Ligand binder design. Structure first.
Ligand SMILES: Cc1nnc(CN2CCC=C(F)C2)s1
Ligand SMILES: Cc1nnc(CN2CCC=C(F)C2)s1
Ligand SMILES: [Cl-]
Ligand SMILES: [Cl-]
Ligand SMILES: [Cl-]
Lengths: 695, 697
């Protein structure tokens, strides 16, 4: 069930041992010594990674290393398509703007932060959650010259349990992290978007990097003189595999959860956030798909925009399925009713008052939040010409010196970025007519962005005519229309431009709604500090893990499949046969790498196949993970690496609010499949030789 | 692999059936000289199978088998198709016009007799050995002079089996007064609707209830208010014991067709011509149809049934091609024929190898013609609605060329025009479908092989298919109502003779009939070679582990209640439950609406004695029995011969089972009898039907 703080390992250890854990507590996490924790990294600010050799080799997902593989790909050496395998350390490619963060030390600073907070005075101050305020406290505790006296090291204080617990992290950051290896995209992204959030899964989602440092192993930016880091700890690789019911554990950096939502917040998330995202994205995607299917050139131009929209659409469908069928609302209601009864018994009414303040705040912002999601989903992300060029103050106060051409050059650059090779004005007009029709039906005239009032006032309710007019008369409606404006530019033309007025008007409403909604966050936050305080005083920390906040957490469970629906069972493990069943050479998402197909045909699995001679690909576990856990090391009962987490099934996405024991699984790439690909596909033997592989 | 056995083969299979779990005595299941469970099985309405379940002639079959009768009795005031039907007394049971139930009274091996008669050969290539007319003359000769007059209700029929190597005479008893007794609402009877067709897991309560009526002496009689329920020779006891994984299950019914003795070349032909053309052409047609239905709600109403009718055999062809690709159907037929050829070489008899060679040579010879036939049938005959537009008859054209017979010819043509351009026909959708279908057709069929009118695409329209199609509707008398009315006011034979739609339709039907006539002669050499081929297979390996091809005759099949793995890491168990119906509920999709009375039964757990040991309500199960089309409604029996369900479908992964049984994929989809009884009881509230059945604990 939980995403536990490293501090909570002591209190969970006996439960973990009864579940199968065999390694000693301090070998996994030792607060004053080297432990497995020291081999885990926050990879490039989002993902998790792990050190797997005494020469700083790091494993993470392919989707985590995707941008670096793409930045080094050219028509001559397309690493994204064919994979990359540096045959020597000197061939490993440096990456600009990359980082790996080690969690050197973790300290409970709750009493210290709570003493400092007593000097606030204003009771409803938000300094207790301010990164700027907590950084001043962190700096004060570490010293006046900490990062100079301990180079590469930094400190950070974070709030947990709604402001009831504070931890200080001493971090070591390395910025010379080089690309070492990657399978082709056909393996690394096998299912592509079709299999996103899907179990069974057949994707070899991995990529390999190496941390470099100065001669003393201290962090240093890229330099040809940098040498591979010798870490204090690295993971041993297991080739023993997994079996159903085996203990599995993960360490990583889950980003966000909402485990302490009130029942009213679950209803708001369903009826506003999720229903609007689902309704608006289905309209947008439906028009896009029709146009992509009708024109091959439209499919090329809009495939990525279609796939980007679908990702959170699928998440919202999964989340709403949990709200509808797994009693998320009812379970939050029971949680808060239990606290209210306990507070009444003890004579402390502050807990019931805190739940009431959250409910009152949620009910109060309903119309505003609905208007915000409607404009964000319907127009801000729904309509491409909402992000068309808007003349800046310095551009208009230049068009009306001869720096008129400089202003035109800047506006032209933005027009060319809006109307780029992938933009179709015809597809955008079709999407806008469908999206605005829905938007205008849901948002009353008095709440419309000013320009949209012209649909009723000037265009007799004809959305198609209003959209046609924007493109017919706008300087950004076509290249010829822009060039005619650029030849004779006037501020008067820009000020009355229908597309400029649309874009300005919709962004004005979007910012006004955001500014009007921001003040509702703080009362909920303050009430949650009291709410979680009561929940913890009443039941303690055993089932009540702290919400994820991009900090190092551990989770444990077992390798186990699940039943998605009546009479259907998904087992715990997928195989290479499953990749071959999915092969479709005429669908780019399901093309199979010819070298991998030959490995399957000749059964050239070496020591990587399971006892029955079948080649494993992926497995799933009852660990509790979320976004930020991509690339996380998956460990055995002995702490040996058995896989890398890379996804979670859609049926478990509601697990950010309520863990779903019978449906929620972490989707993990089997380490035996990773090694099979490095070996038989990449032929990169030196990477296998530098790892410590246990029989 | 696993089969559809003749009743005559029960003796030789009995010990294998007993070792698999069968407990009933052989002669209680089938006895040629007495009453057996076979006597409770019926051919329901010429296609389906049914079963007698009471001493008062109550019959169970599928909902899709009784669908037309439920629909014929439905009105706006009493919509039985939507709300179900439950006659609360026998006098309320509704008669049905054009219905029948056929009992198989006796079955007799007449092989020796038919082979002696055939020896009077005038032509060694005669097809009389397979002719229904010739075999009927032999059956009439054996049965007696005026047998139907001396035995009213009875009839005699001889059928050929094993390609003409075995003959059985059936004595059939037909009843034509079969009344509608009960039916669940369509939301239960067709729960998955077309979305779940050929699908396992399945949650459909596919059943309907009828009653056979007869005269005072139980003899067949057409509908009469004086008819009384039939007291039958035998009926099924209903089991409430349920099913568990690995339990023995058996079925009796009337499988229609199989191709278990196809050569490897016939498997290749079926894949590369029949299936690939059907798949390619139906995907084009369905793709245009779906796009138009999604864009216009009125088009969705008009084309939904045509879309669903096209999809049914499309899905079957996809499942059949998946089996050819992944289950080694071709290779296994090649091994079967290579084994026979080797054995024939050792026996000193080359006739078996010569027979396989004649089939391969015939298949290779008709390739181009068969390809052209399927291309026109799938691409135009079925693919384009204006191919079935009106064509003036020879007598219609004569009437238009000095009498009042002109107005009669125009009234007949108008009637056909109104049937073509009916409430569900859209000329715009049809023009879009035709442009896509003709584009594919013209790419595959060379100019010299085109129906004459289609040559105008290249010759007159510069290859513009859209312009050719636009012209057909712009200038045709059947292009619009106004265009027809203008023709009907001033009709001339000259106008009809030059009409672009008449010329298109005539031209495509001419090519279709010419291809059919040119292909027909290739059937007989294959048929004659198959008689020798199957004779060799039988002489070599015995009439023991190779079953005769299905031919709409009574067969039995046995297996176990077992699920299967469709793909890597996915397992479908043997049993579905009422919880699965509730998971699928979607009130905004007519296919997945849940009956309010059924939803309340589930919520209250009002399952009575129908739930399984764990308190779960079963809906359907699947078994390793070997079934095909014609087995819908078949009784599914226990090891003791008690009714445990009704067969209603088979999963798409097993459709290749008509050529090669697929032990790890092919399953019969069966509605659990406990679910049938739950629906009769808790939804229909028709207690009298439960009381007349013999329900065993
Ligand atoms: C391709 C597919 N598109 N939808 C599929 C099923 N589910 C629906 C709910 C959420 C998901 F992530 C995926 S498979
Ligand atoms: C609706 C659908 N649900 N499943 C589908 C896939 N298969 C493909 C092969 C044959 C079938 F019968 C159905 S279409
Ligand atoms: Cl380190
Ligand atoms: Cl011979
Ligand atoms: Cl099989």
């Amino acid at each position: 069930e939980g995403m536990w703080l490293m501090q909570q390992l002591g209190r969970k250890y006996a439960q973990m041992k009864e579940r199968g854990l065999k390694m000693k507590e301090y070998d996994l996490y030792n607060p004053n010594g080297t432990s497995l924790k020291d081999a885990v990294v926050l990879f490039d600010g989002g993902c998790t990674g792990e050190v797997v050799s005494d020469r700083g080799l790091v494993l993470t997902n392919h989707h985590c290393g995707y941008d670096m593989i793409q930045a080094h790909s050219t028509l001559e050496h397309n690493y994204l398509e064919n994979g990359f395998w540096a045959m020597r350390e000197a061939d490993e490619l440096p990456n600009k703007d990359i980082s790996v963060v080690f969690i050197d030390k973790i300290e409970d600073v709750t009493d210290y932060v709570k003493k400092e907070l007593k000097a606030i005075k204003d009771p409803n101050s938000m300094d207790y959650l301010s990164p700027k305020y907590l950084q001043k406290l962190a700096d004060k505790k570490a010293g006046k010259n900490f990062s100079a006296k301990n180079p590469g090291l930094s400190v950070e204080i974070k709030a947990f349990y709604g402001g009831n617990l504070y931890l200080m992290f001493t971090k070591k950051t390395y910025t010379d992290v080089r690309l070492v290896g990657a399978p082709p995209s056909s393996i690394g992204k096998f299912g592509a978007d079709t299999d996103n959030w899907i179990w069974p899964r057949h994707t070899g989602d991995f990529s390999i990097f190496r941390i470099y440092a100065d001669k003393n192993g201290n962090p240093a930016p890229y330099s040809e003189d940098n040498v591979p880091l010798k870490p204090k700890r690295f993971f041993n690789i297991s080739l023993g595999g997994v079996q159903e019911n085996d203990y599995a554990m993960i360490m990583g950096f889950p980003g966000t959860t909402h485990r302490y939502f009130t029942a009213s917040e679950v209803d708001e998330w369903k009826s506003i956030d999720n229903d609007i995202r689902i309704r608006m994205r289905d309209i947008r995607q439906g028009v896009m798909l029709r146009e992509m299917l009708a024109d091959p050139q439209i499919k090329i131009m809009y495939s990525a925009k279609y796939a980007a929209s679908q990702n959170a659409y699928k998440r919202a469908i999964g989340a709403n399925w949990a709200i509808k069928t797994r009693g998320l609302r009812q379970n939050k209601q029971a949680m808060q009713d239990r606290l209210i009864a306990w507070g009444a018994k003890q004579g402390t009414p502050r807990y019931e008052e805190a739940v009431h303040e959250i409910d009152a705040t949620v009910a109060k912002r309903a119309d505003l939040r609905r208007r915000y999601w409607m404009i964000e989903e319907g127009i801000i992300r729904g309509i491409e010409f909402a992000r068309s060029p808007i003349p800046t103050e310095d551009e208009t106060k230049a068009l009306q010196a001869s720096a008129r051409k400089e202003a035109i050059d800047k506006i032209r650059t933005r027009y060319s970025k809006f109307a780029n090779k992938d933009y179709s004005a015809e597809v955008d007009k079709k999407v806008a007519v469908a999206m605005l029709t829905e938007y205008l039906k849901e948002i009353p005239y008095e709440n419309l962005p000013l320009h949209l009032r012209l649909v009723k006032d000037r265009f007799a309710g004809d959305v198609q005519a209003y959209v046609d007019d924007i493109f017919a008369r706008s300087v950004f409606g076509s290249e010829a229309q822009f060039d005619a404006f650029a030849a004779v530019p006037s501020v008067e033309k820009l000020a009355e431009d229908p597309m400029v007025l649309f874009a300005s008007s919709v962004f004005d409403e979007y910012r006004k709604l955001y500014n009007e909604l921001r003040p509702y966050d703080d009362p909920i936050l303050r009430a949650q500090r009291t709410y979680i305080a009561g929940l913890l005083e009443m039941d303690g920390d055993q089932d009540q893990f702290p919400d994820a906040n991009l900090t190092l957490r551990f989770t444990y469970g077992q390798v186990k499949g699940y039943s998605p629906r009546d009479n259907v069972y998904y087992g715990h493990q997928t195989t290479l046969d499953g990749v071959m069943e999915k092969e479709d050479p005429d669908n780019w998402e399901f093309v199979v790498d010819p070298k991998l197909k030959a490995v399957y045909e000749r059964k050239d699995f070496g020591r990587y196949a399971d006892r029955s001679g079948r080649m494993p690909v992926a497995f799933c576990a009852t660990t509790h993970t979320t976004g930020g856990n991509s690339g996380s090391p998956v460990m055995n009962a002995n702490g040996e690496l058995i896989g890398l987490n890379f996804d979670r099934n859609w049926e478990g996405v509601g697990g950010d609010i309520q863990y779903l024991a019978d449906y929620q699984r972490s989707i993990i790439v089997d380490i035996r499949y990773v090694l099979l690909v490095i070996d038989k596909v990449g032929g990169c033997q030196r990477l296998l030789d530098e790892m410590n592989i246990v029989p």
